A = this chain, B = another copy of it.
Amino acid sequence: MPAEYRYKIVMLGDGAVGKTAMTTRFTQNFFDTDYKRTIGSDFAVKRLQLDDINAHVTLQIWDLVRQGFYRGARGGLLLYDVTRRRTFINIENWKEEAFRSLQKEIPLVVVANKVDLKDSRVVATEEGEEYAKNNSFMYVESSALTGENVEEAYANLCRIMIEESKDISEMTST
């Protein structure tokens, strides 16, 4: 039987960067320009199997008060829109907000979203890689529209959170 893990994660980033679209792509495996997100739902749920380690993860994916939004989160995706430089500048403010609300660091994966929009891209790959490296975060280029690397971003975060759970088990078992 697989090992079982459960985590709440948060989607972070400025408005219109694709937080809802990425969550819909991951949980419902489609994209719709006219998707209507409803106010009557704090989070989506995904159950994910990781073959490499025979582990099953149940995720609650929260997407925008602030205190309740962050409370209990064990990880997050930190998104920007590669076509809008202001959304990239603001990822640091989102990281700081999350860490201040939780009073601890949690793992974040930096997600450069909308990479399918090649002709209007303004934030270069190397800029995002550098920001992530400076914070020891992983970096993923994604498109909710095409699906490119969307599952990969969430799976990467899941593996990090599992390794942290294991670390904590060892610390409590000395």
Q: Which of A2-10, A19-27, A34-42, A156-164 contacts B (4 or more CB under 8 A)?
A: A156-164
- Are A163 and B138 interface neighbours, CB within 8 A? no
- Are A170 and B96 interface neighbours, CB within 8 A? yes
Could you tell me which residues of chain A, from 90 to 115, have a CB within 8 Å of some CB in chain B? 95-96, 99-100, 103-105, 107
A31 at the interface (CB under 8 A from B): no
- Are B107 and A167 interface neighbours, CB within 8 A? no
Q: When the two chains form the complex, which single residue of B65, B96, B134, B170 contacts A100, counting CB atoms closer than 8 Å?
A: B170
Mark each residue of chain A from 149 to 174: 1 if its CB lies under 8 Å from any CB of chain B, else 0.
00000001001100110010011001
Query: Which B-chain residue is minimally distant from A159 (CB atoms)?
Result: B134
Q: When the two chains form the complex, which single residue of B65, B104, B137, B156 contacts A174, counting CB atoms closer than 8 Å?
A: B65
Chain A interface size band reads 20 to 34
Oligomer: number of copies: 2
Residues in B with CB closer than 8 Å to A67 are none
Residues in B with CB closer than 8 Å to A167 are 95-96, 99, 105
A136 to B133, CA, bound (A): 10
> Given A136-B136, A137-B136 in contact, is the A103-B171 Cβ separation under 8 Å?
yes
A135 at the interface (CB under 8 A from B): yes
Interface residues of A (CB under 8 A from B): 65, 95-96, 99-100, 103-105, 107, 133-138, 156, 159-160, 163-164, 167, 170-171, 174
